[PDB]
Design an enzyme around this catalytic site. Structure first.
Site, PDB file in Angstrom:
ATOM      1  N   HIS A 120       6.412   6.612   6.405  1.00  0.00           N
ATOM      2  CA  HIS A 120       6.124   6.272   5.007  1.00  0.00           C
ATOM      3  C   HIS A 120       5.531   7.751   4.224  1.00  0.00           C
ATOM      4  CE1 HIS A 120       2.604   5.892   7.591  1.00  0.00           C
ATOM      5  NE2 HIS A 120       1.781   6.434   6.630  1.00  0.00           N
ATOM      6  N   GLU A 152      -2.748  13.844   1.919  1.00  0.00           N
ATOM      7  CA  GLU A 152      -4.036  13.511   2.572  1.00  0.00           C
ATOM      8  C   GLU A 152      -4.647  14.552   3.533  1.00  0.00           C
ATOM      9  OE1 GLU A 152      -3.005   9.684   4.661  1.00  0.00           O
ATOM     10  OE2 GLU A 152      -3.825   8.883   2.988  1.00  0.00           O
ATOM     11  N   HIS A 191       1.014  -1.235  -0.032  1.00  0.00           N
ATOM     12  CA  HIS A 191      -0.048  -0.097  -0.114  1.00  0.00           C
ATOM     13  C   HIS A 191       0.741   1.356  -0.043  1.00  0.00           C
ATOM     14  CE1 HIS A 191      -1.714  -3.292   2.083  1.00  0.00           C
ATOM     15  NE2 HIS A 191      -3.105  -3.150   1.625  1.00  0.00           N
ATOM     16  N   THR A 219      -4.684   6.609   8.746  1.00  0.00           N
ATOM     17  CA  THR A 219      -5.434   7.162   7.534  1.00  0.00           C
ATOM     18  C   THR A 219      -5.795   5.960   6.607  1.00  0.00           C
ATOM     19  OG1 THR A 219      -3.700   7.766   6.399  1.00  0.00           O
ATOM     20  CG2 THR A 219      -4.731   9.487   7.653  1.00  0.00           C
ATOM     21  N   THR A 220      -5.411   4.653   6.848  1.00  0.00           N
ATOM     22  CA  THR A 220      -5.671   3.213   6.395  1.00  0.00           C
ATOM     23  C   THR A 220      -6.271   2.488   7.190  1.00  0.00           C
ATOM     24  OG1 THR A 220      -3.336   2.261   6.742  1.00  0.00           O
ATOM     25  CG2 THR A 220      -3.535   3.918   5.150  1.00  0.00           C
ATOM     26  N   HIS A 226       2.379   9.265   1.330  1.00  0.00           N
ATOM     27  CA  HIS A 226       1.218   9.002   0.485  1.00  0.00           C
ATOM     28  C   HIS A 226       1.517   9.908  -0.634  1.00  0.00           C
ATOM     29  CE1 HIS A 226      -1.000   6.769   3.437  1.00  0.00           C
ATOM     30  NE2 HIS A 226      -0.319   7.832   4.419  1.00  0.00           N
ATOM     31  N   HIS A 237       4.551  10.732   6.580  1.00  0.00           N
ATOM     32  CA  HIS A 237       4.128  10.445   7.973  1.00  0.00           C
ATOM     33  C   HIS A 237       4.886   9.738   8.805  1.00  0.00           C
ATOM     34  CE1 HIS A 237      -0.368  10.573   6.407  1.00  0.00           C
ATOM     35  NE2 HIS A 237       0.245  11.792   6.879  1.00  0.00           N
TER      36      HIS A 237
HETATM   37  N1  LIG Z   1      -1.156   6.724   7.382  1.00  0.00           N
HETATM   38  S1  LIG Z   1      -1.208   6.595   9.225  1.00  0.00           S
HETATM   39  O1  LIG Z   1       0.207   7.302   9.345  1.00  0.00           O
HETATM   40  O2  LIG Z   1      -2.244   7.291   9.569  1.00  0.00           O
HETATM   41  C1  LIG Z   1      -0.854   4.743   9.619  1.00  0.00           C
HETATM   42  C2  LIG Z   1       0.349   4.662  10.271  1.00  0.00           C
HETATM   43  C3  LIG Z   1       0.323   3.146  10.613  1.00  0.00           C
HETATM   44  C4  LIG Z   1      -0.625   2.404  10.277  1.00  0.00           C
HETATM   45  C5  LIG Z   1      -0.412   0.839  10.912  1.00  0.00           C
HETATM   46  O3  LIG Z   1      -1.372   0.106  10.425  1.00  0.00           O
HETATM   47  N2  LIG Z   1       0.616   0.496  11.458  1.00  0.00           N
HETATM   48  C6  LIG Z   1       1.463  -0.516  10.969  1.00  0.00           C
HETATM   49  C7  LIG Z   1       3.001  -0.109  11.029  1.00  0.00           C
HETATM   50  C8  LIG Z   1       4.022  -1.313  11.175  1.00  0.00           C
HETATM   51  O4  LIG Z   1       4.101  -2.090  10.278  1.00  0.00           O
HETATM   52  N3  LIG Z   1       4.876  -1.549  12.249  1.00  0.00           N
HETATM   53  C9  LIG Z   1       5.283  -2.764  12.634  1.00  0.00           C
HETATM   54  C10 LIG Z   1       6.161  -2.792  13.771  1.00  0.00           C
HETATM   55  C11 LIG Z   1       7.809  -2.348  13.655  1.00  0.00           C
HETATM   56  C12 LIG Z   1       8.649  -2.756  14.444  1.00  0.00           C
HETATM   57  N4  LIG Z   1       9.697  -1.958  13.735  1.00  0.00           N
HETATM   58  C13 LIG Z   1       9.617  -1.100  12.753  1.00  0.00           C
HETATM   59  N5  LIG Z   1       8.035  -1.502  12.602  1.00  0.00           N
HETATM   60  C14 LIG Z   1      -1.683   2.795   9.532  1.00  0.00           C
HETATM   61  C15 LIG Z   1      -1.897   4.024   9.042  1.00  0.00           C
HETATM   62 CU   LIG Z   2      -4.765  -4.064   1.071  1.00  0.00          CU
HETATM   63 CU   LIG Z   3      -4.399  -3.566  -1.268  1.00  0.00          CU
HETATM   64 ZN   LIG Z   4       0.263   7.552   6.288  1.00  0.00          ZN
END
Ligand SMILES: NS(=O)(=O)c1ccc(C(=O)NCCC(=O)/N=C/Cc2cnc[nH]2)cc1
Ligand SMILES: [Cu+2]
Ligand SMILES: [Cu+2]
Ligand SMILES: [Zn+2]
Ligand SMILES: [Cu+2]
Length: 259
Positions: A93, A105, A63, A197-198, A95, A118
């Site tokens: 990351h 966004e 994504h 936002t996802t 967008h 973000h």
């Molecule tokens: N677009 S947002 O900034 O609102 C956003 C931020 C995070 C998520 C989310 O779903 N978080 C998962 C992030 C992740 O993969 N973390 C894994 C743990 C990790 C440990 N070291 C690095 N990452 C969704 C939207």
């Molecule tokens: Cu998906």
């Molecule tokens: Cu997808």
């Molecule tokens: Zn984001």
């Protein structure tokens, strides 16, 4: 096979079918109407303490792509601003949109930038990111706009790696990246309570949206759009756009620092 995305049949307008909180009271992003922004003397300058940040790998999650940070200790933290306590940096990351006139966004008086960065942080009060993500004071995301203009050499270091992670699930080693190199010189901000936002769209985010953009060239923006939503072997689906549009403010208050 079913997940969600930004395409014809899996897009933001349908996310509420799978994640009902999509239509909740505190969804993000929002448009920031600058004439409505409130001045709160309780707000402090942001403290982004990133000197000892340890970047690990860059990953295509199908994504967007994340640069992942070591969040096992207080190595890169965010404090002050609108926040109480310490929030650890876990990843950043972006967008972006399918042309340079769209892709952020958040918007500012309806203006869209080409992209938005973000920086994602979680409240160490909760022990881990996942637990934090389910609490209203659990997360803090710093958003930074990318404005088309001059090429950004710090960003070019990120973009030079995208050829290694073209497809979903690919990752590459990405050491010694200073996430502070992607911040503007002035850290004035807007803040409001919102959401991821996802999917899963959880209402756990104190948003901190910087007023001053960083630069990006039009050439550089082409590079974002060379990524793939799909896994290798599957029909190619170019990562042309991955932004959720502005959501209803619903009588939330946007505060501005220093005004
Ligand atoms: N677009 S947002 O900034 O609102 C956003 C931020 C995070 C998520 C989310 O779903 N978080 C998962 C992030 C992740 O993969 N973390 C894994 C743990 C990790 C440990 N070291 C690095 N990452 C969704 C939207
Ligand atoms: Cu998906
Ligand atoms: Cu997808
Ligand atoms: Zn984001
Ligand atoms: Cu679906």
């Amino acid at each position: 096979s079913h997940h969600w995305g930004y395409g014809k049949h899996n897009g933001p307008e349908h996310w509420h079918k799978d994640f009902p909180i999509a239509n909740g009271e505190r969804q993000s992003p929002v448009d920031i109407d600058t004439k409505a922004v409130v001045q709160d003397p309780a707000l402090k300058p942001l403290a982004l303490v990133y000197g000892e940040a340890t970047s690990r790998r860059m990953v295509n999650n199908g994504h967007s792509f994340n640069v992942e940070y070591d969040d096992s200790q207080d190595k890169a933290v965010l404090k002050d601003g609108p926040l109480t306590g310490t929030y650890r940096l876990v990843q950043f990351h972006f967008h972006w949109g399918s042309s340079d006139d769209q892709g952020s966004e958040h918007t500012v008086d309806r203006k869209k930038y080409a992209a938005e960065l973000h920086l994602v942080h979680w409240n160490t009060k909760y022990g881990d990111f996942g637990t934090a993500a389910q609490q209203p004071d659990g997360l803090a995301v710093v958003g930074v706009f990318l404005k088309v203009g001059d090429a950004n050499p710090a960003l070019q270091k990120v973009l030079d790696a995208l050829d290694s992670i073209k497809t979903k699930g690919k990752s590459t080693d990405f050491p010694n990246f200073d996430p502070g190199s992607l911040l503007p010189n002035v850290l004035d901000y807007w803040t409001y309570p919102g959401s991821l936002t996802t999917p899963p769209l959880l209402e756990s985010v104190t948003w901190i949206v910087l007023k001053e953009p960083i630069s990006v060239s039009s050439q550089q923006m082409l590079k974002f759009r060379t990524l793939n939503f799909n896994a290798e072997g599957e029909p190619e689906l170019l990562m042309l756009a991955n932004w959720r549009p502005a959501q209803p403010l619903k009588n939330r208050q946007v505060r501005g620092f220093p005004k």
